[PDB]
Each structure stands twice: as structure tokens, then as C-alpha cells.
Amino acid sequence: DLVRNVVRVVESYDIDARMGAEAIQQLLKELDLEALEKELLEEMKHPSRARRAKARKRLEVVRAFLDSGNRPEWMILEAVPVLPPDLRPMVQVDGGRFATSDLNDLYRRLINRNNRLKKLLAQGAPEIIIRNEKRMLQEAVDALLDNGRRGAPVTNPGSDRPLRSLTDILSGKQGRFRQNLLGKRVDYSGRSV
Amino acid sequence: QLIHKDTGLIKEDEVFLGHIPLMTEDGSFIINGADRVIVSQIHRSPGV
Amino acid sequence: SDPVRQYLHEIGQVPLLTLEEEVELARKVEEGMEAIKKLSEITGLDPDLIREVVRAKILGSARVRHIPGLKETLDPKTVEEIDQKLKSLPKEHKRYLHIAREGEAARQHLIEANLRLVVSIAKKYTGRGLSFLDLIQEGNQGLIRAVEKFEYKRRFKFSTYATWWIRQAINRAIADQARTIRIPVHMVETINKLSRTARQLQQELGREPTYEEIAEAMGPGWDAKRVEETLKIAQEPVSLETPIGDEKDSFYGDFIPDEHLPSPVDAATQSLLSEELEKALSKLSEREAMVLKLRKGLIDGREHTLEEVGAFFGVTRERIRQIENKALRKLKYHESRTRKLRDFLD
Amino acid sequence: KEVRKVRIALASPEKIRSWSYGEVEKPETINYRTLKPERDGLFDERIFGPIKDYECACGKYKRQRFEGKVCERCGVEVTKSIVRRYRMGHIELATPAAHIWFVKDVPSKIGTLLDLSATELEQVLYFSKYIVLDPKGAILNGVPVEKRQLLTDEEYRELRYGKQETYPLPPGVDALVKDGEEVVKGQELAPG
Amino acid sequence: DQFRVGLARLARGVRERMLMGSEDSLTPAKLVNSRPLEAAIREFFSRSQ
Amino acid sequence: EKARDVKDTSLRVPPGEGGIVVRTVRLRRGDPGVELKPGVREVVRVYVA
Amino acid sequence: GKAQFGGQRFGEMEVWALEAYGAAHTLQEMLTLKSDDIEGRNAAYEAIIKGEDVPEPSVPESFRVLVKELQALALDVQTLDEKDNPVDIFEGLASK
RNA sequence: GGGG
DNA sequence: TATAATGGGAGTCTGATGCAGG
DNA sequence: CCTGCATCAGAGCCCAAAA
Numbered sequence A: 001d002l003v004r005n006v007v008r009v010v011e012s013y014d015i016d017a018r019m020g021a022e023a024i025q026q027l028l029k030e031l032d033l034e035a036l037e038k039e040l041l042e043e044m045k046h047p048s049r050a051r052r053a054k055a056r057k058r059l060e061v062v063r064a065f066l067d068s069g070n071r072p073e074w075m076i077l078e079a080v081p082v083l084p085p086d087l088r089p090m091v092q093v094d095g096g097r098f099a100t101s102d103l104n105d106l107y108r109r110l111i112n113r114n115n116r117l118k119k120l121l122a123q124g125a126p127e128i129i130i131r132n133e134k135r136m137l138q139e140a141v142d143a144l145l146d147n148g149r150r151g152a153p154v155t156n157p158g159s160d161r162p163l164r165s166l167t168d169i170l171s172g173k174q175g176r177f178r179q180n181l182l183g184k185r186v187d188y189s190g191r192s193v
Numbered sequence B: 001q002l003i004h005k006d007t008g009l010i011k012e013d014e015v016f017l018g019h020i021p022l023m024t025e026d027g028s029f030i031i032n033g034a035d036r037v038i039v040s041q042i043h044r045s046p047g048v
Numbered sequence C: 001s002d003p004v005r006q007y008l009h010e011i012g013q014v015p016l017l018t019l020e021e022e023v024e025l026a027r028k029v030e031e032g033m034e035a036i037k038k039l040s041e042i043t044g045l046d047p048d049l050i051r052e053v054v055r056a057k058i059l060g061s062a063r064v065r066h067i068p069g070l071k072e073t074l075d076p077k078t079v080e081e082i083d084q085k086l087k088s089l090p091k092e093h094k095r096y097l098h099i100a101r102e103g104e105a106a107r108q109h110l111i112e113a114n115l116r117l118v119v120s121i122a123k124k125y126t127g128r129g130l131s132f133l134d135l136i137q138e139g140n141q142g143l144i145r146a147v148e149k150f151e152y153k154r155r156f157k158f159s160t161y162a163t164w165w166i167r168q169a170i171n172r173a174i175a176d177q178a179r180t181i182r183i184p185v186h187m188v189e190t191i192n193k194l195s196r197t198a199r200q201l202q203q204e205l206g207r208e209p210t211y212e213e214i215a216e217a218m219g220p221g222w223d224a225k226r227v228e229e230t231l232k233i234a235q236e237p238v239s240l241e242t243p244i245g246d247e248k249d250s251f252y253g254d255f256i257p258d259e260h261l262p263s264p265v266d267a268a269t270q271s272l273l274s275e276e277l278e279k280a281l282s283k284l285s286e287r288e289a290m291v292l293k294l295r296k297g298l299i300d301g302r303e304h305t306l307e308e309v310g311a312f313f314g315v316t317r318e319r320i321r322q323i324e325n326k327a328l329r330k331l332k333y334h335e336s337r338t339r340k341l342r343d344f345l346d
Numbered sequence D: 001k002e003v004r005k006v007r008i009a010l011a012s013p014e015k016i017r018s019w020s021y022g023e024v025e026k027p028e029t030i031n032y033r034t035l036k037p038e039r040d041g042l043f044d045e046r047i048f049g050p051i052k053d054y055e056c057a058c059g060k061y062k063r064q065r066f067e068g069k070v071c072e073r074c075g076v077e078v079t080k081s082i083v084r085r086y087r088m089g090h091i092e093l094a095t096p097a098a099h100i101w102f103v104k105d106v107p108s109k110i111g112t113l114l115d116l117s118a119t120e121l122e123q124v125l126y127f128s129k130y131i132v133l134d135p136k137g138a139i140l141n142g143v144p145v146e147k148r149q150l151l152t153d154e155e156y157r158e159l160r161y162g163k164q165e166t167y168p169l170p171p172g173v174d175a176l177v178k179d180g181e182e183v184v185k186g187q188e189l190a191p192g
Numbered sequence E: 001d002q003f004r005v006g007l008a009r010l011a012r013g014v015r016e017r018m019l020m021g022s023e024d025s026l027t028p029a030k031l032v033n034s035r036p037l038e039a040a041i042r043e044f045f046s047r048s049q
Numbered sequence F: 001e002k003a004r005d006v007k008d009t010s011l012r013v014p015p016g017e018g019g020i021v022v023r024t025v026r027l028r029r030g031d032p033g034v035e036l037k038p039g040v041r042e043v044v045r046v047y048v049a
Numbered sequence G: 001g002k003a004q005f006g007g008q009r010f011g012e013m014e015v016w017a018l019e020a021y022g023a024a025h026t027l028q029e030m031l032t033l034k035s036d037d038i039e040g041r042n043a044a045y046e047a048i049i050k051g052e053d054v055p056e057p058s059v060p061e062s063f064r065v066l067v068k069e070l071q072a073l074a075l076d077v078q079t080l081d082e083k084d085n086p087v088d089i090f091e092g093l094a095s096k
Numbered sequence H: 001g002g003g004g
Numbered sequence I: 001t002a003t004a005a006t007g008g009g010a011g012t013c014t015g016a017t018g019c020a021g022g
Numbered sequence J: 001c002c003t004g005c006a007t008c009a010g011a012g013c014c015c016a017a018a019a
């Protein structure tokens, strides 16, 4: 206070508390999987049946990562992959019109929000604004990977049709497996009455 | 007719809302050159 | 669980400013900017670098990153080094450090207290191709611009100035991000003009206008041809996944052939063409085939015209044009017998 | 060699970057006039490969005698255009994001490892509640804050920024206390 | 039913235009944009099931 | 023979179809009463019985 | 479809028919040379018009699409040999 | 909506 | 770039499994 | 401990499929 000539100290702590996948990536990094196996094995020696049951389910995930060599923090994305363009084409149809894959609109949403987030950070926006931007980014990643899974399905404007995400492409009757992989259209074939 | 709830002003005009498709004599429609039919829909009647 | 509802609850946790409170925060931000300018002179630093260093300590350790334009990676080492030079100043110089810090603090509060204004402007701009929250975030971007440019001395309330910058930001956002094929902001303005114009024209005429009727209404420079070309440019692409039919089991992309990759017939043809072409330049002579083959290239495309041809064929320079003709001439005679190459003309 | 096996495993952010041929920096797709791809956008040839077989973008190097050259002017590799089906790009996120399969596929894989319920993992991931990495001796409502505790926003502000309140004084009424004065809860500041 | 939807959408345009641009120099012809109504009717006939 | 500037895109007859040409309608841009979708110079229709 | 000059759909149940008969090379033709195996189908046509027998098929292109789509989901799909070494089904085109 |  | 403007609008039936509750 | 109770992921093939 340069007017009152006093240094105020407002009671509060240097506490580290976070939100979002950034917080979680740290807690996943701060896992020593060897130790948690040890802990869960000691707990596996215990009555009430329920204690042994839950330590098993947990121990199966721990053991899964241990045998495989996968780090738990990989379940959190830093770099998001981009599928090659010929697999999400922008093609000129007969009429000179353009027809394009839904993945392009889902990627565009993601890229905009990421760019806006980079800009809001450099300009030192308040925590309320950076928080809103960060959660929208999660929702944009969520729609890209499995749309409709959590929350409202992302739609093109003025259409009720949910956009077709990576998960929808892989799975279902129309999915990659049951349409183009276990069966195909073929050459040297014909049909008649 | 436009009325101003604040003032008293009244301006009135006939505005163009676009076109509405007409039904032919036999009960069909012409939509972009192709003849079309609107099928009736059965459903639960409102009420209690 | 509802992202809009959640955000509405968070803004409602910052109380709105009193006329006094509004003027107080605005005042502190301006004085702080002046303080940073002065701190630059005294210290021999960069006003922006100082500002990011001052700003870093107010928000805390949470946000530390390289800032585009700053000369230093803005990591804890550099902000401690530079902050220690600022706190090593004499009392009369060091007073400006305290001013800058308090300027940044008030800026944060000023921004946060005006967030509800952005919502009330953005809600009116829905339906133009950006989601409500996308409009809020772009609207918030303008509000940040407005806080930095506000001059409190003019005695205007903050809401008046902010609204211009917020409206400006949303409208730029809609013009930049709404289209799969991005369009220059000025060109989008022209397209929207044609829309309004035609919409008036249709309201007086009771029917759709021609290209010519719109070209007249648009004034000089416009003919019917230019109105059409503009509309062609304004066409938005359509989804490959658009359903065809009431059964949910048909996509538009499935009716689209792949025109890029050669078909089996064509690929077969290209192999067969190369095989007849080499098996044809050798049935005259390999060497007169060697001179001609260099002048075009099988898988390379080596056609110049006169210079480059100076080097290794085997002869000097005008001569290669002549053996090009006898190679081409013997080929021409040799062609009438082995007329198998006629059919490759399609 | 012959394919005898197929393994599937998690991809590190390093490995995701090990695949990538470039970062897609812009939501742009293709240029509205030329119809060619926008530089650094989703279709950029500098990242994913040439549109035409053995031919670069600007057309300095147009045939297969060069395979592997990267044009100095426009930056595009000379190879088969088929590679636009194969080569991956990437987007570098400013803040990390959770992969929804490992969150919302029940019972959550992330949730089970960290001993976090379904409700809790939602609240941290979607910015409804804090989770504490280092209390630094904080204490709230008489009990010490322990690591991995969930705090609401109000709870966090009291810990992080301190607790305060502002009381309006009816216009013209003068306060019963002086500036700087220590005050107990319940003490009377003004007539109302 | 589709007509009623299209009419209500046009009303959104009316109420929003009765706030922006001067609370006086507006007639009914400038206040009404018929695009929502035309699309709803065209939407029903060209694409309803 | 110079490689021509244009290629043959002619409309033909699908496998298994065909008949007698009973009518032709040709619609260009710049003819009374007709304006096609943007970019389209002319539309030709052939009715085969 | 007939209007596109399409091929017939040989679906899940049709594959089962070929499987129960144990006709593996007939089935493999349906899955590769007669559909999306690009190197194979180009090569197979060239063989029939030259009087040679059709070549043994190569990797079907719709599997490569499947691999890349799982990579877009941040999953590492690796084809391995008997020695547990990676096998490259893109023939060097996607690696730097 | 239509064929087996 | 300057009257002031400060919290949104909207839609069946089956069986299996992992969860807060008398 | 056990039981209501929700949230989720399933629901036949091929052809026209008239956009």
C-alpha cells in the first residue's frame, strides 16, 4: 500500500491445485507401478470378499501396463495425430462442387480452439477465460475421437446429423470392419433374374 | 401493420413471404419438375 | 454437466463494478502502463519484456511459457534474474515497480467483472456458423483489446467502449472461421451484400431476381457475369457422409468414383505402351534411339529446345536436330508396318 | 519378410510426433481461388506429399529422375502421390487433453489406476473441481489439506486468494469504525 | 406444422431487429426476412419422409 | 498430330440400354426464360424410347 | 449398383460360405485381386490379357486405411514377423 | 415406400 | 476505436454390469 | 450383504436407394 504505507499479507497458501487433463497427466506420471502392485498384493490377503475383488480389478490394469511396457500418462494426449488427407478427402464432384469428409470440420474446430488458446495464454487472460478455453478444447478433442460419446453430439450448423467421428468410422454395421474388411464389393461379378 | 408501443406510429405494408406449392387437380404436387405425393400419418390422438 | 450453464455460473461469481470501482480499476491500469514505459527508460530493458515479467508474478507460477516476440525464453531463471534487477532499484525508481504490479492486478479484475457483457452481445450473433461458446471466447478477445485501449479520463462508462471492440471481434470470428473453404474477410462482406440486395429485390418484385436485375441494383462495375462468378465462389461444400434415403444405410461418398489412381486397364496400358516404345526405338538403331530418347526422356521429361543439347549426345549441336528427324523419319516408315501404335491415340 | 503377427499398443506423445511429417497450424483447407491446398493447412503438400506423381507444387522439378529431393522454393517432396494416403500430421496442444476412450469406457482405466470415481474424474477433467498436488501446509475448515483432495472453486479461492467480504454503507451514513481497524465477526460497522 | 415452425423462426428475426438499428426508422417491409419461412416449406416438400 | 487442347467427354449409352431418340431439349444460358445453376452454360436432355 | 457399373457385394455371410467349403484361394481372390488390392488387381489384369496366370495377392488397401485410422486414434498398430520384428506394409513410403 |  | 449497453434457448425395448443405499 | 437402478450398446442378407 503506497498510500497507507503498510505491507499487507492476506492469509492464503502457495497451494498447488489444478484442473483438467493436465492435472491428471501429472498424477499418472507420479505412479510407480511396481509399488502399487506391491500394495495391491498385500491388500489381496484380506477378508470381507469386496476388498480382494477391487484390488484385483485395479491389479489387472496395473499388471496390464507392467507386462506391455505402456506408460499410464500416454492415456493423456499432448500431440494429437492427424489422419492422412486422402482418407478424409476434399474432392470436386461432377458439378464442379466440392464434397468433403466430416473429419475436416471436426479438425477445424480443434485447430481454431488450440490457436485461440495459444493467443489467450500469451496475452495473459484471467483464469476464468483460460479455463473456459481449456474445457472447450477437451470437448473438441472428445468430438474428434468419439463424437456423441460424452455430451451433445457435434453437428454441422443447420442439420441434425451428428458428424461422423473416428469411432463411428471404425465400429458398427457401416464401420470399417463389417463393411470393407470382413466383406467387400468385388470385380468379375454380375447379377440377373 | 407496425405499431410503436412507445410512440403511436403506424406504418402498414404488404410484405412478400416467398412462394407456396400448389396441389394439382388429382391430388399431387410438382416439386422441382418431379410429381410428388404427401402420405397421411397415423398417430396417437391428443387427449387424456 | 452442461458447458454453457457451468460458464454462466462462473461469471456470476464476480460482482459487477460500481461507477467508482470501474473508474478505480481503469485508472490503475493506465498508470501501470505509464509506469512500465518509464521503467523501460530507467532500466535499459524492453517495455514488452518488462510487462510480461511484471505480469508473470501477478498470475503466479501456473503460467510460464515462451511468449511470441519476447527475446528471452520466459522461464523461471530469466524472470528471477530480471525481477531482481527491478527490485534492486532505489526507492524513488522502485515505486514504479509497485505501480506496474498493481496495474496488472486491476486489469485481471476489470476483465473478469465485464464477462457478462460479452454474453449479452454474443447471444444475438448465434446461428452464423460459430457455436455459442465460440462466440463468447471471440467476444472475450475483444474485451481484452478494449481494456488495454480504454481511456478513463473521457468520463464514459466502460460498457460503451467495450461493446465496439467485442462486436468487432465476434464479427471477425464469424468471417474467419465459419467456412470449410476459408474466404478473405472483405470478400465475405461483398457476398453478404449480394444476399441483402437480392433479398430486397425479391421483396419488391414478388419473385426471384435474375443475375441482371441484381447486377443493376449493385451499381457500376457489376454485370450479370460477375454476380454469377461471385455466387460460384460462395458455394459451401457438402458432407461425404450425407445420407441418401430413409434406410439409414447409404452415403453420398459411395457414389463418387476415384479419378486419381489409374484403373487396371490404364495401368496395364501404361506398362504395355512403355514396352512397345522401347522395343521400337531399338529396331532402327540403339544409337539413333539413344540420341532421340535423350531428347524427351522415358521417366524424366528432358525437353529443352537448343542450348543444353550442346553437350553429350556424341556430335556437336545442329546435327542432333537432324538425327532427331531421321530417327523420327525411320520411325515414321517403320510405323506403317508395325501399325500397332495407332490405337494408342484413343 | 512375411507378416506373422499383429500387436496393438498405446502411443506416447513422443511416438505420435515420431509419425508426423509436420504440424497443421491453420484451420484453412484449400485456396478459394486457385483450389490448391493452403500452406501449413490440413491439405498442405509440404507435410503429406505431392498431389501429382513425382511432381512438386510450384513445378521446378517435374519427373521421377528426382525421388527424395525437397524443393527449396515450395518445400514439397518428389515421390508417388499415393503417399497422401499414408503420411500423418499432428497438432501440438497447448494444454494436455484426455483420450475419451480411456475416460468414458467403464470402468474407467484412468479412474481405476488413480482410485478416482466416475463422478470425480468428470469434475477434474471438465473443470468443475480442483485436485491438490501439493497442499504446502494448507488447511481448510480446521483439517489439513491432504494431497489428492478435491476442492470446489469457492474452497480454492479461500485457500489460494484468502477470504474477504465487502459491505455497502447506505448513502450519507458514516461508518462507526475507522480505516485500518481490526474487527471481530458480528461487530457493527454502520447503523444498518 | 412445418408452416408454423417457419413462421415462428421469422419472428425471431423480427424481435431481434426491433432491438438493433434505430427504434423508429423501420417499416414492416425492412423488418421481415422471409428466408426462415421459405426454407421450412421448401424443406418439408423437398426432404420430409 | 498436335495433342489437342480438349478431350472427348461425350454423353453416350449405358450398357444394356438404348432405343429410338424421340425428343431433344437443349437449354443454354442467355436464351429467353432460362438461367441454370451457377457456372452451368447449358443443359441438354435426350428422351429415348 | 448397376448405374455406377458397380461390383456385387460379397458380404460377411458370403465369406462364411467360401470358408465352410475351405476354398481359401477363391476367398483370397475376393478379398484382394477382385477388390482393393491395388498392386494385385493391376497386375492380375495384365496377366490375363498376356495369357499368364494371376499373381499371388499383396496387402489389401482397405487394411492400410484401417491401420492409419487407428493411428489417428493414437493407437500403435504393428505388423510383426516370426522373430517379433516389425514388418513395413507401406514399403518405406510413410517413414522418414 | 419397392424385389427375393 | 467512446450516450449506455453486464447470466442461453430446447427433445423404443432388450439384456448385461458397475453403482450408491435400506 | 444384497438389491434396486442407470447408462450403454445391441438389435439378418443382397438389390433397387429416384438425390
Ligand SMILES: Nc1nc2c(ncn2[C@@H]2O[C@H](COP(=O)(O)OP(=O)(O)OP(=O)(O)O)[C@@H](O)[C@H]2O)c(=O)[nH]1
Pocket (backbone or CB within 6 Å): H004, J013
Ligand atoms: N432373409 C430374407 N429372405 C427373404 C426376404 N424376402 C424374401 N426372402 C426369401 O423369400 C423366400 C420365401 O419363399 P416361399 O415362397 O414363401 O417358400 P415356401 O416355404 O416354399 O412357401 P410356398 O412357396 O408358398 O410354399 C425365402 O426363401 C427367403 O429367402 C427378406 O427380406 N429377407
Ligand SMILES: [Zn+2]
Pocket (backbone or CB within 6 Å): D056, D057, D058, D059, D060, D061, D071, D072, D073, D074, D075, D076
Ligand atoms: Zn517446387
